[PDB]
Symmetry: C3
Subunit: 109 residues, 3 copies
């Protein structure tokens, strides 16, 4: 167990297009389920579906939140996302700048 100084986490999610990504971000940010969202459009996603190699353009999303809100955030993202089962993963943040983390935590209240 690595030593951690914060309950903050990073959420990785993918959206089908830029318009969807911006709306999903605006939504969860507005409901204070995330403090910030970074969108990287024009990415290429590869995966198998029914035995066929799929290749589609997607938007990589990186959202910042905390453990206390990770479940609510995923539920919200999933519900508004057009896909039934979109990529929704949470990575742990072990450390960060104190001022940024303070703002991140306050943004969720």
């Amino acid at each position: 167990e690595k030593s951690s100084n914060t309950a903050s986490v990073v959420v990785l999610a993918t959206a089908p297009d830029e318009a969807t990504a911006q709306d999903l971000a605006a939504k969860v940010l507005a409901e204070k389920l995330a403090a910030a969202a970074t969108l990287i459009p024009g990415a290429t996603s590869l995966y198998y579906w029914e035995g066929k190699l799929e290749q589609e353009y997607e938007v990589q999303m990186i959202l910042k939140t905390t453990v206390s809100h990770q479940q609510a955030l995923l539920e919200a993202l999933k519900s508004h996302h057009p896909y039934q089962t979109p990529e929704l993963l949470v990575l742990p943040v072990t450390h960060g700048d104190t001022d940024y983390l303070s703002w991140l935590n306050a943004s969720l209240r």
Copy 2:
């Protein structure tokens, strides 16, 4: 099986797509996101090097991370490619199940 995210790079989109297709076919990863147009910076013997790279983000499980890393390394055009594993501490239950159901 706990899930993980693997960060790796490829010189160009063609190579990134080829490596991704290979590991996905061998069921060593469930999905691969490629972000071309990235710039890599690092020092080498006192000289600042700058290179163009395609950032890869592969999704798999701890039980497959070793096989995935070895496969990416063996087919990689680079001698010392970036290959890092990041832990996934939580995720949507259904997506996590899909990830596992896609691996060997």
Copy 3:
């Protein structure tokens, strides 16, 4: 290649964002020269959304992914913050659980 049971590491990745490519390259160059980071990947074309003073902001920035170790994470963050043109820049540290020992070993050798 060594597996997670036969090798270990204290490597971490740092996520930070910069306003533009010129600033990102300068920030990266600085911390790399100081051996506070071993490598840095810059991804341009990143859109950042967040509320600031009660208003939704939308900035077009560069996503930086820096590689370092727990031993240098604190110094790296202070260095990035000091040179960053932002007041409260995004600076987060994620733990690395495993990786290619050749790459991990190279990173370590490139640090203070």
